[PDB]
Amino acid sequence: PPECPDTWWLCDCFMATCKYNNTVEIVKVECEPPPMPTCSNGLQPVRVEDPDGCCWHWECDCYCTGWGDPHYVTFDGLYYSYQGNCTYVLVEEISPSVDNFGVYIDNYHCDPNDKVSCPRTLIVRHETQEVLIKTVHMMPMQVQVQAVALPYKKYGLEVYQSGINYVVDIPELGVLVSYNGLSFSVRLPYHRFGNNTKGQCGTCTNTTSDDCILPSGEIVSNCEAAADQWLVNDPSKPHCPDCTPSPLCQLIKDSLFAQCHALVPPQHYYDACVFDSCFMPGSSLECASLQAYAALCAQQNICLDWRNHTHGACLVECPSHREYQACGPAEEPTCKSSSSQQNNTVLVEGCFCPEGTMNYAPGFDVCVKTCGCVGPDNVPREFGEHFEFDCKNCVCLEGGSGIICQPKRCSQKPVTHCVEDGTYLATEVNPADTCCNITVCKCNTSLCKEKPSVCPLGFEVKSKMVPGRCCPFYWCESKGVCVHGNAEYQPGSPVYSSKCQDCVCTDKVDNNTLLNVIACTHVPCNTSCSPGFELMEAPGECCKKC
Amino acid sequence: PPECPDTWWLCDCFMATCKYNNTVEIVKVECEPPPMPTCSNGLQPVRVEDPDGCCWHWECDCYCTGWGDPHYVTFDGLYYSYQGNCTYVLVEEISPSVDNFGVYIDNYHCDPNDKVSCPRTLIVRHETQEVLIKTVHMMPMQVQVQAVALPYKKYGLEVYQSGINYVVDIPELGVLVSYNGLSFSVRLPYHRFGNNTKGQCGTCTNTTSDDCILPSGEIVSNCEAAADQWLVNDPSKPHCPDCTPSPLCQLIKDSLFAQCHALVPPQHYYDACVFDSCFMPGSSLECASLQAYAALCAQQNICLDWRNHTHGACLVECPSHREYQACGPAEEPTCKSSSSQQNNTVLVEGCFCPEGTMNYAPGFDVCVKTCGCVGPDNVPREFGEHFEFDCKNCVCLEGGSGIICQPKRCSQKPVTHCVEDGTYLATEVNPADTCCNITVCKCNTSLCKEKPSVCPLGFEVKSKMVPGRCCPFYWCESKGVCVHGNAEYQPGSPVYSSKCQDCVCTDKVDNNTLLNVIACTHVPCNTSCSPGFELMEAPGECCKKC
Ligand SMILES: *[C@@H]1O[C@H](CO[C@@H]2O[C@@H](C)[C@@H](O)[C@@H](O)[C@@H]2O)[C@@H](O[C@@H]2O[C@H](CO)[C@@H](O[C@@H]3O[C@H](CO[C@H]4O[C@H](CO)[C@@H](O)[C@H](O)[C@@H]4O[C@@H]4O[C@H](CO)[C@@H](O[C@@H]5O[C@H](CO)[C@H](O)[C@H](O)[C@H]5O)[C@H](O)[C@H]4NC(C)=O)[C@@H](O)[C@H](O[C@H]4O[C@H](CO)[C@@H](O)[C@H](O)[C@@H]4O[C@@H]4O[C@H](CO)[C@@H](O[C@@H]5O[C@H](CO)[C@H](O)[C@H](O)[C@H]5O)[C@H](O)[C@H]4NC(C)=O)[C@@H]3O)[C@H](O)[C@H]2NC(C)=O)[C@H](O)[C@H]1NC(C)=O
Ligand SMILES: *[C@@H]1O[C@H](CO[C@@H]2O[C@@H](C)[C@@H](O)[C@@H](O)[C@@H]2O)[C@@H](O[C@@H]2O[C@H](CO)[C@@H](O[C@@H]3O[C@H](CO[C@H]4O[C@H](CO)[C@@H](O)[C@H](O)[C@@H]4O[C@@H]4O[C@H](CO)[C@@H](O[C@@H]5O[C@H](CO)[C@H](O)[C@H](O)[C@H]5O)[C@H](O)[C@H]4NC(C)=O)[C@@H](O)[C@H](O[C@H]4O[C@H](CO)[C@@H](O)[C@H](O)[C@@H]4O[C@@H]4O[C@H](CO)[C@@H](O[C@@H]5O[C@H](CO)[C@H](O)[C@H](O)[C@H]5O)[C@H](O)[C@H]4NC(C)=O)[C@@H]3O)[C@H](O)[C@H]2NC(C)=O)[C@H](O)[C@H]1NC(C)=O
Ligand SMILES: *[C@@H]1O[C@H](CO[C@@H]2O[C@@H](C)[C@@H](O)[C@@H](O)[C@@H]2O)[C@@H](O[C@@H]2O[C@H](CO)[C@@H](O[C@@H]3O[C@H](CO[C@H]4O[C@H](CO)[C@@H](O)[C@H](O)[C@@H]4O[C@@H]4O[C@H](CO)[C@@H](O[C@@H]5O[C@H](CO)[C@H](O)[C@H](O)[C@H]5O)[C@H](O)[C@H]4NC(C)=O)[C@@H](O)[C@H](O[C@H]4O[C@H](CO)[C@@H](O)[C@H](O)[C@@H]4O[C@@H]4O[C@H](CO)[C@@H](O[C@@H]5O[C@H](CO)[C@H](O)[C@H](O)[C@H]5O)[C@H](O)[C@H]4NC(C)=O)[C@@H]3O)[C@H](O)[C@H]2NC(C)=O)[C@H](O)[C@H]1NC(C)=O
Ligand SMILES: *[C@@H]1O[C@H](CO)[C@@H](O[C@@H]2O[C@H](CO)[C@@H](O[C@@H]3O[C@H](CO[C@H]4O[C@H](CO)[C@@H](O)[C@H](O)[C@@H]4O[C@@H]4O[C@H](CO)[C@@H](O[C@@H]5O[C@H](CO)[C@H](O)[C@H](O)[C@H]5O)[C@H](O)[C@H]4NC(C)=O)[C@@H](O)[C@H](O[C@H]4O[C@H](CO)[C@@H](O)[C@H](O)[C@@H]4O[C@@H]4O[C@H](CO)[C@@H](O[C@@H]5O[C@H](CO)[C@H](O)[C@H](O)[C@H]5O)[C@H](O)[C@H]4NC(C)=O)[C@@H]3O)[C@H](O)[C@H]2NC(C)=O)[C@H](O)[C@H]1NC(C)=O
Ligand SMILES: *[C@@H]1O[C@H](CO[C@@H]2O[C@@H](C)[C@@H](O)[C@@H](O)[C@@H]2O)[C@@H](O[C@@H]2O[C@H](CO)[C@@H](O[C@@H]3O[C@H](CO)[C@@H](O)[C@H](O)[C@@H]3O)[C@H](O)[C@H]2NC(C)=O)[C@H](O)[C@H]1NC(C)=O
Ligand SMILES: *[C@@H]1O[C@H](CO[C@@H]2O[C@@H](C)[C@@H](O)[C@@H](O)[C@@H]2O)[C@@H](O[C@@H]2O[C@H](CO)[C@@H](O[C@@H]3O[C@H](CO)[C@@H](O)[C@H](O)[C@@H]3O)[C@H](O)[C@H]2NC(C)=O)[C@H](O)[C@H]1NC(C)=O
Ligand SMILES: *[C@@H]1O[C@H](CO)[C@@H](O)[C@H](O)[C@H]1NC(C)=O
Ligand SMILES: *[C@@H]1O[C@H](CO)[C@@H](O)[C@H](O)[C@H]1NC(C)=O
Ligand SMILES: [Ca+2]
Ligand SMILES: [Ca+2]
């Protein structure tokens, strides 16, 4: 046919006006618009491709930032300071395109006035799920509808970490939210969200004039007052109502940030630093705006180290196994699956594993040189290594599931007999293996079956005492004295057996004699008298010289 | 330009002729060849697209199968039976396109005849890696260069399970190797491997005639004789040199397999079944060909349940928490990675978790209903559940890394020994606590001065003895039979304090006679002696009868 049998945008923008099916006037279409001048934000615009492959126009992203306690900068580079306590809406939608979508910021319900214990909580609602990021004295935690871990992904919503920031993103909508504990940033694409947002972050129109509107939809010159009207009522608390310039603030104007003076306007941050320093001196509150300026510069592909120059008073506090770096990868290379990924170009600050080692896997913190397995207890393991974890036999081997554990089945030789009286069979904690639980011939002294063996007065000590046996043996109660003197043999027993017996054995010490000194010196001898005749051996006679 | 400003193949499978730059002579080309009637395999050819998107030809995949001990069928539907005991090569490349690519079957080296646990062993060598798949009585094991786990993936080589088969594949080349313990299968694409393969599986030439070739490279008629010369050399074992047709084989021609009689040639398997039955009756060796026939039918998207009609003698044996299904998904759904639907749409046989439950994750075996966490000890866990795994406080919460564990931080008995002499601090692990040695007082009888109170006499027992303290309390060695007596108050000491006395001591107790049984008896008296008298009670005058 003279007109083409679809005269068409046939391919690769090869457009056409067909004279006939065979002979047509084909056309080719291409173009290139110059880089847009600016976006009332100083940030360089990006390239957005047409639906048609023919061309790409320049459009710049929507960026809202909030730092310090009161400091806000909207999507179009308008800056203002607002103070409040009740939770406030950050960004919402004018015409609902996504169900229950919104970003909110509770600034003081957690900590009113001074936010020293907890500065803010960030609420992100997307359809079914809501995420509340809150901070405490040492490290923030997040609650999803219940607490969760950091590397979270569910229903197109992802939460993770990057440098010193907690990032909540929706890839389908391209929404990025970064929380720091001292500031927050919201990043939105232009085409998806163009002139359809409202809240304290203003309207992403590329115009600074319409950057604040009331919920009704009016325009007010006093942009600070419009922020106070963006209050979200909730069940709890329904009764919502001379300066010497510190040199630190001078760091913005120094030559260190001279590279940042291009591609990023420094007027707002310097004024915020000066105001914070004059609010009260010597509180280390003026090195919070510097962090935001450095973060924005890094986002602008300009990485700088500045904290060195701050003479301390605010640094990073992360554990020993990590070292602080001003320029580092946004996504650290975990050993588990670094694989291949688009290396982005913006190096962010933070603290990472040392140069020699590297992180193990997402959700872990142990840095290792050559990674094998990591169990629930953070201890590095090598491939083909045998270690008794818990009460089991476990092995780290290459493949899936890592650790493989099997039961212990420890056994001991069962002995029931207990020979000594003290020995009594008792199963008890196996000392070597708390799990083996081996039984043992326990020892009770009370169960001593044999009894003390009484001995004669003569013996001294059975020596059985403290034998060290399960049953304590007993020493002999008797002792060495001339016991076997006479009759019932005891220590003196010098009964007068002789007609003139002396034998006064007084336990006189002698070999065997001590035990038995028969010191008998009878004197049965008879001595004459002047008239007592026949006195030789007469009854009861003793020597008598008379 | 009148000459086309590159008359050329226009993009999008179009073409052009050019006598004008815009007014050109446009063309477009395409086709639909009839499906190749057959491919000498009985298998339907697959659609292979050209480089450019213009046309799709019908080339049939290369499939090599071998079941039982001696049976083999080449890539082109040629069948032969070969018996051998040393390792043989299945497929290798005539022109080396991939470094160190090969498949080897080790037959009989591990089990010579009457396989005790390993019928054979597969060796798949690809570049730097080699994989050895071996079997034992109940589960196969794989060694990768040392042992590895089941879900293995490294350097473009992947090893996993599917139904009852172990699958080794290289996604870059499309090579598939399936092992079962009773058979094996090799699947190769045509374009990558055409007229470049050699070995026992033959030439994937699409002609049965050229399938068998000597290692030198000749053509011979008998495939079996050539197969014997495909032997590879290793340091190990370097010295390599009445039939009643059972109804089980008759199941092949039954109406159950009627769908398989088309689209799949059933002659070879039936002949193999008959020959195996004739080899020895009643040994359950004739239900291995049925398995391969059913597997090939299932590969053709035709699932059949047949083991129910075998009247036993060969079924599956997998643990109780899994039930056998003749038609199920090749890749079972696991909660960790539900991701997208499995469009495999071929229902391989095997055994899976029951319909109520679902498998937890790859590399795991526990079937669960609502998945939470699974630690090294295979126990299901719920979200927000607190347990005492190892000696730690651990929690299962949804997110990254699953289980979060922290130290027990066990408290201790604050005691200083104890005041009992003998006590020494033990700081021991109270059975009530676990992993918690706490200070405890350890009375030591060896470490006591029990101050034995030496009693002079008559004290039958001090009675300190054993009262419940570890100190060895003291009994008193003394006893009172004759505490009194001139002889140092010795017991049984009857001596005349006065020569005229008896003081009889029988050592008796009585009432205080235990202290003084001797008491005394007065012998003295004087009576009438010779006239003239004057005896005057002559001193020493004890009772006389003068
Ligand atoms: C950081 O920080 C720091 C501090 O400061 C602070 O901060 C800042 C930021 C600001 O703010 C301020 O203001 C504050 O205060 C700073 O500092 C600086 O540094 C630098 C560097 O370093 C320097 O310069 C240099 O240095 C060197 C050494 O270093 C050292 O020292 C220093 C001082 O001086 C310091 O600072 C540092 O830190 C260091 O320290 C050290 O450390 C070590 C360790 O590591 C140690 O060691 C130790 O000890 C012992 C000994 O050694 C043992 O044995 C061992 O070893 C260990 O243990 C040491 O001791 C320490 N030291 C000290 C003293 O401290 C030096 O040496 C030099 O000297 C030089 O000069 C001369 C003349 O010319 C010559 O003769 C010589 O030879 C030399 O040379 C040189 O070299 C160097 C090095 O390289 C250089 O430096 C550098 O370089 C580079 C290259 O590339 C670049 O250029 C840069 O820029 C630079 O700087 C130089 O330059 C050269 N020179 C020539 C021309 O030659 C010197 O001294 C400075 O001085 C400083 N200052 C201060 C103030 O201090 C920083 O800067 C920061 N950073 C950042 C990042 O920012
Ligand atoms: C040997 O070894 C051992 C150790 O070892 C262990 O154990 C064993 C069994 C096994 O198991 C193994 O294995 C292991 O390892 C030992 O044990 C120990 O001991 C200790 C010492 O002894 C103790 O502590 C303490 O003790 C005391 C005494 O003792 C006793 O007991 C025990 C237990 O507990 C035993 O064991 C022993 O043997 C003894 O026994 C007894 O004894 C008693 C005394 O003699 C007797 O009694 C008698 O009789 C009658 C009654 O019956 C009468 O009446 C009187 O009483 C007496 O005469 C008994 O009979 C027996 N039994 C048997 C069975 O034998 C104790 O006493 C103590 O306790 C107490 O105190 C406390 C304080 O605090 C309290 O609380 C409590 O309650 C009590 O009190 C009273 O007491 C009494 C007496 O005893 C009673 O009665 C009786 O008891 C018994 C016990 O057994 C039984 O029950 C009977 O039935 C009943 O009747 C009451 O009841 C009570 N109550 C009240 C009223 O209060 C403490 O106990 C420990 O404990 C132990 N442990 C164990 C576990 O056992 C052993 O000893 C050895 N042995 C030998 C011989 O050596
Ligand atoms: C209580 O307390 C007590 C005290 O008290 C006392 O005593 C008593 C009995 C009573 O009498 C009371 O009265 C008095 O007071 C105590 O005990 C003690 O202990 C301590 C500690 O242990 C000791 O120390 C030691 O020493 C030594 C010397 O000496 C010794 O020896 C001798 C002979 O020679 C003898 O005689 C003595 O006795 C002694 O012995 C001893 O003993 C103990 C007790 O028993 C013992 O302990 C214990 O034991 C048990 C059983 O029974 C078990 O065995 C346990 O385990 C243990 O612990 C000891 O052992 C023993 N020893 C001996 C020798 O015998 C020295 O020598 C020593 O040193 C050593 O040892 C140590 C540990 O112990 C160590 O550490 C060191 O190093 C050393 O080493 C040694 O070396 C030696 C030489 O060579 C040896 O020997 C020999 O060896 C061989 C091989 O080579 C073989 O075995 C043979 O058999 C052997 O003999 C050894 O063995 C080694 N050892 C080791 C392990 O190493 C120490 O220093 C003391 O002495 C004691 N004392 C007594 C007398 O006894 C307790 O203990 C307490 N507790 C409770 C019971 O409660
Ligand atoms: C792998 O193994 C498979 C199983 O063996 C095999 O599948 C089929 O195998 C059959 C048996 O081998 C095979 O049958 C053919 O038989 C021919 C001899 O008899 C035929 O020719 C005489 C006249 O010479 C004729 O009287 C008689 O009736 C037969 O007619 C033939 O019928 C064929 C089947 O319909 C037909 O092939 C079909 O062509 C279709 C075209 O749209 C379509 O592609 C179908 O898919 C295809 O099957 C064939 O064209 C026709 N011939 C004529 C002239 O009537 C053999 O000659 C023939 O071998 C040739 O074909 C196979 C592929 O089929 C080639 O591999 C092989 O190299 C031969 O190449 C052929 O060469 C002849 C001579 O030059 C060509 O004849 C010309 O045809 C022109 C029109 O197309 C024109 O008339 C010219 O004047 C003729 O000279 C012929 O076209 C060439 N074919 C091709 C495609 O190369 C074959 O053995 C059957 O064809 C096989 N079908 C397929 C594709 O599966 C499979 O082929 C094997 N594959 C490979 C890679 O080897
Ligand atoms: C990203 O991609 C690579 C670097 O790889 C990146 O960082 C790794 C640590 C991993 O995280 C990766 O997942 C991640 O993508 C770089 O692109 C270019 O790579 C080649 C090496 O393949 C560099 O060498 C160049 O090319 C050849 C050598 O292959 C030679 O001509 C020269 O050696 C030449 O230098 C190349 O330099 C590098 N690109 C640059 C900087 O020119 C790069 O870091 C980055 N590229 C992107 C994202 O475009
Ligand atoms: C034997 O002794 C017991 C007391 O127990 C003993 O006391 C010393 C002799 C010790 O050396 C040990 O041998 C032993 O511990 C007498 O039992 C009782 O004694 C008391 C005190 O004398 C009597 O009380 C008296 O009773 C009299 C009247 O009988 C009164 O006149 C006194 O004023 C006083 O109340 C008590 O009655 C008595 N009871 C008994 C059991 O008789 C025991 O009498 C005595 N027997 C002998 C052999 O004399
Ligand atoms: C294509 O165009 C030529 C020139 O007009 C004409 O002669 C021919 O018939 C056309 N063919 C078709 C299919 O329109
Ligand atoms: C170029 O295109 C025009 C319009 O179709 C045609 O008239 C002319 O002949 C073409 N050839 C030349 C001169 O490039
Ligand atoms: Ca605006
Ligand atoms: Ca062939």
Residue numbers in the entry:
A (entry chain B), B (entry chain A): 4349 to 4354, 4375 to 4513, 4518 to 4613, 4637 to 4941
The authors write:
The MUC2 mucin polymer is the main building unit of the intestinal mucus layers separating intestinal microbiota from the host epithelium. The MUC2 mucin is a large glycoprotein with a C-terminal domain similar to the MUC5AC and MUC5B mucins and the von Willebrand factor (VWF). The C-terminal part of MUC2 is made up by a VWD assembly, a series of VWC-domains and a C-terminal CK. A low-resolution image of the MUC2-C closely related MUC5B C-terminal has been published, but currently no high-resolution information is available for the mucins or VWF. Here, we present a model of the C-terminal part of MUC2 (MUC2-C) revealed by combining Cryo-EM and AlphaFold modeling which show an elongated dimer held together by covalent disulfide bonds in both ends.
Using Cryo-EM, it was possible to obtain structural information of MUC2-C from the VWCN domain to the VWC3 domain at an average resolution of 3.4 Å. The MUC2-C dimer model shows two regions: an N-terminus with a compact globular peptide chain and a C-terminal tail with the domains in tandem organized into a stalk that ends with the CK domain. The MUC2-C homodimer globular region in the N-terminal end presents a C2 symmetry, whereas the C-terminal tail had a non-regular double and twisted stalk conformation. The VWC1 is followed by VWC’, a truncated VWC domain, VWC3 and VWC4 domains and the C-terminal end with a typical CK domain. Our structural information shows that there is no VWB domain, but rather a serial repetition of VWC domains, disturbed by the truncated VWC’ domain only containing the C-leaf part and the two disulfide bonds acting as a knot. Interestingly, for all domains in MUC2-C the N-leaf subdomain mediates domain dimerization. The C-terminus of MUC2-C shows high flexibility due to several bending points. These are located between each VWC domain and within the Cys-knuckle subdomain. During particle selection and 3D volume reconstruction, this flexibility made it impossible to extend the map beyond VWC3 of the fully glycosylated MUC2-C. The Cryo-EM map loses intensity after the Cys-knuckle of VWC3.
